[PDB]
Write a protein that binds this ligand. Structure first.
Ligand SMILES: C=C(O[C@@H]1C=C(C(=O)O)C=C[C@H]1O)C(=O)O
Ligand SMILES: C=C(O[C@@H]1C=C(C(=O)O)C=C[C@H]1O)C(=O)O
Lengths: 284, 286
């Protein structure tokens, strides 16, 4: 019987937001210590929660709903301080005209949808008739007055589709910053608690490899954008701006934002307003 | 509509035999120009043939059965010149006692099983009662006199299980070399013909990236083995020996071996004995 140690099963978001990180994981050879799974953020969160992955990215709302069973990695996340560029509301009308109007939500999102609902309700005071559908701006603009998008589709609406067709594109990160002054965190990295307790060293090494790969990707952001631009409708300058506008930090100022967002949406989303976020503790 | 160009869909064998190549694809950043799929060699061959992949590894028999629709990459393959270490016959008896005996074959193989049958029949003159079962050396040795294994399971039988339990392990690469003097090629890399003709430059760039990634993996074989040993029952020295015993070349001497193997098995395996292997042509420069 082969009872040798097994690589951690690690998730990775397929969107452009984590393409630089994938570059870093490959350049550092870290990928060869992982058994990697690429998918959308809602699927990767489902897999980690049910046990098909050991470590991976988790959209913030789903982490908070499972905070007792997950331990978040410090100092890396998918966030913003101001505009995030790839989490948007695309609207054919001013936001204050969306009361009772139909608004399409993308099923790939869990956190951005709730943030958009929080802003429209508590900041702008409109209660749209929401419905969820696959991310497809052209279809959404035919059936609804506004749509919430994330990932490459939102980035495409922001940088290309919106300007071409004269559609308003509201940046969810900017709207939150205007409303609260705070940065925002859309996804964190976490280990299953049972895996973190069974394999403390592998969990710590995976954490440190993510930080090393993240740091390298920010040093080589221009290389990453030049290569990625060859496969996208976005050009090199647009990708480099996107990669540098994203905020991958996860320290005290970012946890402050998570705390307040959880407090405002918890009682209407399925977790306590004062939910505890457990961070992976470093070695003494 | 997003009509931008799309990355080639590229397969990659999950076995240890192609782990150094995976290291090179990652270190060179080539992976970020691929949409990669990792799987077993028989699944990756099915996907490429049916159109779920554009470029990828193909076990030799399946390539030969689809040679009209595939274009093989020159100068890279999975092969040997002598022992391959990870394609074996594990037997409790001398091979010449296998006539009418039970021999278990692993369904993960297409080329190694036919090579083992060719050797047992045409070199040793025995006609075993073959049957297929999942790769499980302990189970196979309980129900049969011999078993054919590939991949990590065969390497495990060769380096660990065989010596521990006193079982003979015959290297299919060595047996072929003894019989013919020739090296052997178990798998090649190929593009779908329709993809190669639709995207000639992406195809060429994928080919060149594989050669660059292969070259780097042989330069850094010790690094690769040291890292991989932490996740395997094999130690660093065993993996480094394995990675350097494998032969990743695919030039004239290796095509000579493919030609002769195809001639001996073609008419009983599903392709002409003189099947034509089309290689990706290099660009002429004026
Ligand atoms: C920055 C982004 O935020 C995303 C928003 C998420 C959500 O709303 O559930 C999930 C993953 C994040 O990557 C993006 O998708 O580009
Ligand atoms: C070198 C090897 O040869 C393998 C043999 C093949 C087959 O028999 O179908 C397929 C892929 C090769 O990787 C190995 O198993 O490691």
């Amino acid at each position: 019987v082969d009872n040798s140690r097994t690589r951690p099963r690690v998730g990775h978001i397929q969107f452009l937001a984590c393409l630089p990180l994938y570059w870093g994981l490959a350049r550092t050879g870290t990928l060869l210590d992982f058994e990697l799974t690429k998918d959308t953020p809602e699927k990767l969160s489902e897999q980690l929660v049910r046990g098909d992955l050991d470590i991976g990215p988790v959209t913030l709302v789903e982490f908070l709903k499972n905070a007792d069973d997950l331990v978040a990695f410090p100092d890396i996340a998918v966030g913003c301080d101001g505009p995030v560029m790839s989490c948007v509301i695309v609207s054919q009308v001013p936001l204050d005209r969306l009361d009772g109007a139909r608004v399409a939500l993308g099923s790939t999102s869990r956190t951005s949808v709730r943030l958009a609902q929080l802003l429209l309700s508590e900041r702008f005071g409109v209660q749209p008739d929401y419905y969820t559908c696959p991310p497809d701006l052209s279809l959404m603009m035919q059936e609804a007055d506004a749509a919430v998008l994330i990932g490459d589709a939102a980035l495409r609406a922001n940088m290309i589709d919106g300007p071409r067709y004269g559609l308003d594109v509201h940046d969810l990160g900017a709207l939150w910053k205007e409303w609260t002054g705070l940065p925002f965190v859309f996804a964190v990295w976490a280990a299953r608690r049972d895996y973190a307790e069974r394999e403390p060293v592998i969990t710590r090494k995976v954490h440190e490899a993510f930080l090393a790969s993240r740091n390298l990707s920010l040093e080589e952001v221009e290389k990453v954008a030049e290569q990625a631009a060859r496969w996208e409708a976005f050009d090199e300058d647009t990708l480099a701006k996107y990669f540098t506008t994203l905020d991958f930090r996860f320290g005290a100022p970012q946890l402050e934002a998570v705390t307040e967002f959880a407090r405002r949406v918890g009682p209407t989303t399925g977790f306590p307003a004062d939910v505890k976020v457990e961070l992976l503790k470093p070695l003494e």
